[PDB]
Amino acid sequence: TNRSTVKISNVPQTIVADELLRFLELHLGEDTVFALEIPTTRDNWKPRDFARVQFTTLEVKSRAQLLSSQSKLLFKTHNLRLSEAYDDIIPRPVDPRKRLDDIVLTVGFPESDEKRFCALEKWDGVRCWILTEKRRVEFWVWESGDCYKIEVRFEDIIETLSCCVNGDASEIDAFLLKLKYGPKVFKRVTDRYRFCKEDFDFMWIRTTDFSGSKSIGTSTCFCLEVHNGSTMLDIFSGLPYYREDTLSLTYVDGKTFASAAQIVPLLNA
């Protein structure tokens, strides 16, 4: 129940990923298979005897396991045996609630003793994925075409605060994450046996800060401008050291603190 990726024991050597995807979608529900990859001993002309398939929902995985246990899966006179896998094809949480798209992400630090938060740089349309098994939160920011991944571990964050952006005290539309250490920054770099349902044919490598003003390096706290979130508090309750209190913040014009030097958080002379 920890992961939805399932490993198939034996598959015919003459099949392609599309045929297996069609067979699974015929036996199971429609478009219930997220990713399917068949390992190859060569570049593109020698698949192996097994394959790994990642489903969209855990109930689909349970149904597939039940069908495989009853030997009800017969694909080209071969009985497909299902077993647990070591790692997922894509680090994607199996939850329709933890996937947040088109949200406002800004970084900064408290300005003075008052409940005020200055915004250094603001990003729009970012993707946030909350992973509980991996104990990390990913932030996908698209900047000038190439996308970046910001990973924050559960140990780097010391306190979680729920706030609001519209000023209404009854609508929690913001979340402040007090970070002790710094987040990891990645960068995207540029098919017959891999469906993947999306354009995920890239790799992540660690790079330096991508902000022109280096706002990330000088900010120790994050902010997540989200919607009203009637049931979002339950999702945010899983973060370590969560505060069950309501707090309000005020945006402060702090765009002056921008250093173009390599060493960001030093004071100006």
Binding site: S69, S71, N79
Partner: protein
Amino acid sequence: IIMFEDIFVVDKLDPDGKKFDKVTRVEARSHNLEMFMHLDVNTEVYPLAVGDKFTLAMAPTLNLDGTPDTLADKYEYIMHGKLYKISEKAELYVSFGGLLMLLQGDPAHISHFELDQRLFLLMRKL
């Protein structure tokens, strides 16, 4: 009249096919005795699927109380073979005219089997 008798449960198949038109080697783990078995059963003629339970018995003869070399109504997979290797948790090697059988269990469970003898194989899927 029966030397060995126990209930077996299949665990996996070697070909893992439905219409391979070939002999399929079965691997059934015994219950209450902890014995592992290998047997070549033709699935096209005698169907066997993973997870099914079946009984197995071995007798030196099919006649009642003697006459070596009427159990046909009870069982349905009667075979005839010879044990040609006993030395290995002792294991047995019986060939049913080319269909190899491996019966690896306990040393005390397999002690009344002589070398180079004719024995039958009675099997029923409950």
